[PDB]
Amino acid sequence: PHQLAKKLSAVDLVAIGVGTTIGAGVYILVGTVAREHTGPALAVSFFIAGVAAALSACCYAELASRCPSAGSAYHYAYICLGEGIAWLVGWALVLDYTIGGSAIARGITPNLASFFGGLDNLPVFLARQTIPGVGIVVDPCAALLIMIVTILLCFGIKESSTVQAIVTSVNVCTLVFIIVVGGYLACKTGWVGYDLPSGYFPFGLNGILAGSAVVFFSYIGFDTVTSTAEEVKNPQRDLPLGIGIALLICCILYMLLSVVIVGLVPYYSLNPDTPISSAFGDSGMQWAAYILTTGAITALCASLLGSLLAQPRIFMAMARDGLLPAFFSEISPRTQVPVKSTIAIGVLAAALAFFMDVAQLSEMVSVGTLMAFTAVAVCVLVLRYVPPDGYFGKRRKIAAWSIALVCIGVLGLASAASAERLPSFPRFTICGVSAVILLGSLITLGYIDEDEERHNFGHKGGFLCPFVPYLPVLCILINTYLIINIGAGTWIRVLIWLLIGSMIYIFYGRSHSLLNN
Amino acid sequence: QVQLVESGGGLVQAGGSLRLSCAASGFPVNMYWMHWYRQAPGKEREWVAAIQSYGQWTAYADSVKGRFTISRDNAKNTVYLQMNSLKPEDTAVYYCAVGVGGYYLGQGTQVTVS
Ligand SMILES: CCCCCCCCCCC(CCCCCCCCCC)(CO[C@@H]1O[C@H](CO)[C@@H](O[C@H]2O[C@H](CO)[C@@H](O)[C@H](O)[C@H]2O)[C@H](O)[C@H]1O)CO[C@@H]1O[C@H](CO)[C@@H](O[C@H]2O[C@H](CO)[C@@H](O)[C@H](O)[C@H]2O)[C@H](O)[C@H]1O
Ligand SMILES: CC(C)CCC[C@@H](C)[C@H]1CC[C@H]2[C@@H]3CC=C4C[C@@H](O)CC[C@]4(C)[C@H]3CC[C@]12C
After folding, report:
1. Domain covering B5-107 in this structure, CATH number
2. Residues on the Cytoplasmic side (chain A)?
3. Are B98 and A266 in contact (CB < 8 Å)?
4. How many domains does chain A have?
């Protein structure tokens, strides 16, 4: 039948989430921030980032458990924020996941020239050969990995899920071994590598927040878990538990790595006594570097496998509602999985990784997921207070205006606090007025109690965010600040992409679409 | 391999200013924290300042905060410690150290006041 198979399980959701998260996590830990902050400071930065990601994941889990559907943030934005804003959230999410997978593949390929360790096998006709254009600089590269991953995903949800589970379990086991070795070495040397003169957290909460600002994008895997909601047997129970256990395991792993391996990588490289060599002889860091590269590559491969399984679901939801041609809607009669939409997304990601460099792909990815988070936060706020269905008769309108005011005030004060180019004299006025209207709206929102019709939306029961009046607003503030912080380089590209999206929508999607035709 | 050579220290009039240049070798100066260390003949080592490997944030000890400015030159691979306001309290030998902690220590230089 034309129905997705509910063959996935809670353990399989945890595996998907942890793999997708750990890939980006290791990508960041290999980056500049790792050596920017001290070990313990990096760990607490990951802790705060995990707290914020949990603020977002609570809304995700609530909306997924109550009304499970493959549309993910698209489906949610379409119900609360309404149509149109959804097509912009879903389109941005598609671009984000696609460019994440493409960047991961483009980064993996050069390091994967051999089995591990960065060695080169010297292939022929598959190596990177710059296009000899008169004034063209493109450097095409082997993007077959995307084709293999797309074939895997097209082969079913259990088969691809099982392969992802195998890869991510191997990754987690090697990471656990890598942490145990690091801890054993540290205890053998007595943690002498952490005799930091400036002490831990040398820059105060100011740094811990600055570090957590860039370390926040390491927890971007729960949205994919939501995207695969339709495959779960009883999503109401598994999805929230799976997402929670995935953000918990990822946070613990990140803190452990940051305190044992990353915060000491300088120690093992600089100290003349060379404890690694003294503990393992002549081989020394050579085997340690091989093991670290193995762990990083396994994590990146797991996340590459995980990423491209969301976009087909988003496209399926879009086509099912009607904003995309039915070409994306139909599923395989045999594999019970998007095969045409998955193939289209796979060929798109393959082309994007083939042409664009990793340094260029990384400059466009970040914005979509933040918008999805903000949208889902506004969605919990609107579905738990003013659900769009069915003491005061004006309670609905006042609550709606209060939510609009909190949405405006967060923007106002997050752009005031993140805009140092503005003179202080009007900056103070704008931040103060935005803050006071936000506080007043929050007071009004709390004064008006939760609508009891919230017992009706989706299915009864399920998970509900802990602090509905304050937690969603905190998530909105965090995500809006992160969005505004992002530089114009990524904003111009996402703007042109969203413009393309709006073009497609106005030319086809508004004229032909269910609930509007 | 990693090696640090520093110069600039010397006798100076009281209340003057100094800049100590610590030249890196065998590694780009950007990829590691760079700290500075002190030690008077009758005292044990005394951390001074610590630039941040990536980005250019700096932190200083309580006894010296604000007085000293630590900068870096990514082209010449040299780290500079600028003393805006000296006092006899700082009379001691100076070292520049790589890594988040004191993993490698330079040859050293001496500074004195008059
Ligand atoms: C899941 C986790 C993911 C993150 C993991 C961390 C990733 C980041 C660190 C990478 C790393 C971890 C070593 C760990 C040791 C044991 C730890 C415990 C292991 C427990 C199980 C492996 O570095 C390896 O070597 C490559 C060298 O280029 C490096 O390249 C680049 O990759 C990244 C490009 O952005 C970037 O990060 C990385 O810095 C880059 O170099 C690769 O990362 C890797 O192949 C660093 O290795 C150290 O590099 C030192 C360079 O000077 C080297 O210095 C010595 O030799 C010099 C002459 O060479 C000499 O002049 C120095 O005086 C002497 O000191 C050390 O000998 C070597 O050990
Ligand atoms: C997502 C949220 C939490 C991120 C918040 C980032 C904030 C805390 C960042 C943005 C700019 C940062 C400042 C930029 C530069 C300096 C100078 C340095 O000598 C000390 C730290 C200090 C003063 C930083 C403190 C932290 C800071 C204020």
Report:
1. 2.60.40.10
2. 62-72, 154-164, 222-244, 310-340, 449-463
3. yes
4. 1
